[PDB]
């Protein structure tokens, strides 16, 4: 009921966004370079989404990933089930990586089995959001440097290579089960293969905590500020000399066995994920759709606005409520920090994307229906109509199908899993929540 | 469905946990130190919990917060509803902080209403969990230091103390409302007071710059703490030149409005929250009860998850028996999470640092579970007061606070967006 005390202070906080949107833009002159929508071209297509569910038992998070591709062709599904012990943040970011990795895989594999003159793939989110901020950020990058420093710079390279090789083999081996059954219960590689790898590259070098050194930059800053006292302490130097030493400097550090064993796992899972973005970018027409992303850190690397916001701008200013599309003038590039130098050479389609960038456009499929954020590898002009063959209505069918189908209104493992973990040995952890 | 290889993989992963626990490092000689519950003592008590609902509109989070106290007096309650601009971590983390802010207040005020020879508060969580990894962090620290550098030390401490004051009149106003109606709709201060404090200490120190940015002169003075972007900017120069320009206060920064604003907001919330712990820390018998807790840190920082040990026993010693087991050595908090220029202001936290947190595993009845029990004082003292209220499998004031806070089916579900429908814009309200 009430809370009404707040309300205006909500409404304001809302509107004080928009009344600052129609100001700063000065309409940004762009809304009028808006181009109503092109003429449908016939394509064969697959839309895909995935959904995860998680539950905790004590220290342990238990999750079931599901990913689904619907389209011009049969229904294809990747699913995975696992448990991993919990860091409150780091965990979720791991699950979501795997989730994302399942999509990337499903996406590309789906491309390969799509026959046609005009072949396209639709995704449930933004291409940007993935590569601008890597999930598990203050873990993944830290973990790779932790690994590289662990086993050495070259030993690492082989590890990367061995693992990719395992991965290439993986996709082919997956590719089979999608033919026969059109589903797979093990889309994810890193988990099963992690133990083996460890004892090869790791278990030799390790001796029972231990000493690595990496740069101060493999984590921070946060802050983000610096003591005054240092400028005095280091002086008679040039700001340039200092910044060198600053950004450069090696900090030391100590590592237990699990710490190592985790860094390994992270490194891999990170590598796997990457390898699916690469092997995904290979898709000729790659289509990313999202009803809502948010613009923060994006207008940073330039200025743009959330769809929902925009949607209102046009309908309360230029009056439209009208169907069509608006491209953004700037093919936008990626940041290279999310991609360690020693990584990219393995995934060139990523490397490619940094040089070429993404093309973004807002879109409205109908009337008093709403505005979506389109991103694509190729150009909006080219990619857009392809998508358009499939519009059902307020929007496209196959996306609508993927969204709806992979929806879990019923968790299998709800009754199922734990009730069989009563069985094997111990029903107590099962007790729990 | 299931792979049953995945199931094996799952069972597997879990069992290693137990056996590696049954490796009995500190466990071997720990378990037989298991004591039987003491006798109950008469105590007046308020168990408190809180729940939160959130929903997204584009890049804007809507959240509704509730806290509830049930116990040896009538039912006290807090609620707050609001919106923030979404940053995946930061938003969801600032809710969380606010949530703990009510639960803490509510716990502090509930105490002050208490009648008994022994008075106690019962909280739904762990003491350690919040303060070994504070909510919204490292973000909450960088932001402080941002302002400390930005608005400068003196006018900062000026800001600190003022805000603190406003917070005192806040609590009193709250206690009042609590009395009469037993409820309050504005438990949270910062959101209402931020924009006012922005004009004072922020807008003062800044001039408009270009698109969405501002030009900020850096003051001078106790760390002086220049923002890192000041070395960034000064690149062609000698360090001596830099200080001289710092001395004469030529130096300006080009950083963005919103970042600063947000940094401010983050700062206040974080203080309104620290006030919240410092107050709740005035409670003389304060207990926290969590069935499961954990973290990768919860071993290393100087010992095990309840459910593992719960299992280990019936599967070793055969007890499955009621009782408790007190972890021997009190735990102090890691001091990094609590800025030194802050605790000066919050004694009890500062005090909590020195004295530390007593922890014990407690099984209230029979083959029921093992809750984690944490307190500002000795388990031996507190546990008796708790036990006075043992309901059943576990304590009533709490199971009430639980069931009672669950009391939200989504209110704003039909409601809020429908009256946002009104004012002018339904557009975002369209979930679009
Ligand atoms: N795990 C994770 N990392 C980064 N950004 C995320 C994540 N999950 C959701 N998002 C946000 C960021 C973008 O707006 C979009 C990316 O969708 P996607 O299809 O997942 O590429 O969704
Ligand atoms: Mn999705
Ligand atoms: Mn709770």
Curated annotation (Swiss-Prot), chain A:
Ways its activity is controlled: Exonuclease activity is stimulated in the presence of HerA.
Major enzyme class: hydrolase
Molecular function terms from GO: endonuclease activity; exonuclease activity; metal ion binding
Record's keyword terms, sorted: DNA damage, DNA repair, DNA-binding, Endonuclease, Exonuclease, Hydrolase, Manganese, Metal-binding, Nuclease
Positions bound to Mn(2+): 49, 124
Necessary cofactors: Mn(2+)
GO BP annotation list: DNA repair
Signal peptide coordinates: none
Entry EC number(s): 3.1.-.-
Function comment: Involved in DNA double-strand break (DSB) repair. Probably acts with HerA to stimulate resection of the 5' strand and produce the long 3' single-strand that is required for RadA loading. Exhibits 5' endonuclease activity and both 5' and 3' exonuclease activities.
UniProt subunit comment: Homodimer. Interacts with HerA.
Similarity comment: family membership: Belongs to the NurA family.
The protein's name in its UniProt record: DNA double-strand break repair nuclease NurA
Gene name per UniProt: nurA
């Amino acid at each position: 009921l009430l809370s009404k005390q707040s309300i205006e202070r909500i409404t304001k906080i809302l509107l004080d966004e928009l009344e600052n949107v129609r100001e700063n833009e000065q309409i940004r002159n762009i809304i009028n370079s808006w181009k109503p929508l092109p003429s449908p071209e016939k394509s064969s297509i697959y839309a895909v989404d995935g959904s995860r569910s998680v539950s905790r038992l004590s220290g342990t998070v238990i999750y079931f990933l599901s990913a689904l591709a619907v389209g011009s062709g049969k229904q294809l599904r990747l699913s995975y089930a696992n448990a991993i012990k919990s860091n409150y943040g780091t965990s979720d970011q791991i699950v979501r990586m795997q989730m994302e990795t399942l999509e990337n895989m499903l996406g590309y594999l789906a491309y390969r089995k799509l026959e046609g003159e005009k072949r396209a793939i639709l995704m449930d989110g933004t291409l940007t959001g993935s590569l601008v901020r890597p999930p598990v950020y203050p873990e993944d990058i830290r973990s790779l440097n932790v690994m590289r420093a662990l086993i050495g710079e070259s030993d690492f390279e082989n590890l990367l290579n061995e693992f990719l090789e395992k991965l290439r083999d993986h996709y082919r081996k997956v590719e089979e089960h999608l033919e026969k059954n059109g589903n797979y219960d093990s889309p994810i590689l890193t988990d099963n293969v992690v133990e083996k790898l460890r004892k090869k590259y790791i278990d030799t070098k390790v001796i029972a905590k231990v000493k690595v050194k990496i740069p101060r930059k493999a984590l921070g800053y946060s802050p983000r500020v610096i003591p005054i006292e240092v400028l005095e302490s280091s002086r008679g130097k040039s700001v340039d000399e200092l910044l060198q030493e600053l950004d450069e400097e090696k900090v030391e550090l100590y590592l237990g066995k699990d710490d190592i064993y985790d860094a390994l796992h992270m490194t891999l899972s990170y590598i796997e994920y990457l390898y699916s973005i690469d092997k995904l970018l290979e898709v000729k027409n790659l289509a990313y759709i999202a009803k809502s992303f948010y613009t923060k850190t994006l207008a940073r690397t330039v200025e743009i606005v959330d769809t929902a916001l925009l949607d209102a701008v046009i309908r309360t200013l230029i009056g439209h409520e009208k169907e069509g599309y608006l491209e953004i003038e700037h093919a936008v590039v990626p940041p290279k920090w999310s991609f360690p130098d020693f990584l990219l050479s393995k995934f060139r389609n990523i490397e490619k994307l940094i040089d070429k960038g993404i093309h973004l456009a807002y879109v409205r499929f109908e009337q008093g229906d709403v505005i979506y954020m389109l991103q694509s590898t190729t150009n909006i002009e080219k990619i857009l109509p392809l998508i358009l063959h499939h519009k059902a209505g307020g929007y496209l069918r196959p996306l609508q199908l993927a969204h709806h189908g992979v929806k879990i209104s019923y968790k299998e493992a709800r009754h199922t899993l734990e009730a069989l973990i009563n069985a094997l040995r111990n029903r107590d952890p099962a007790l729990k929540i």
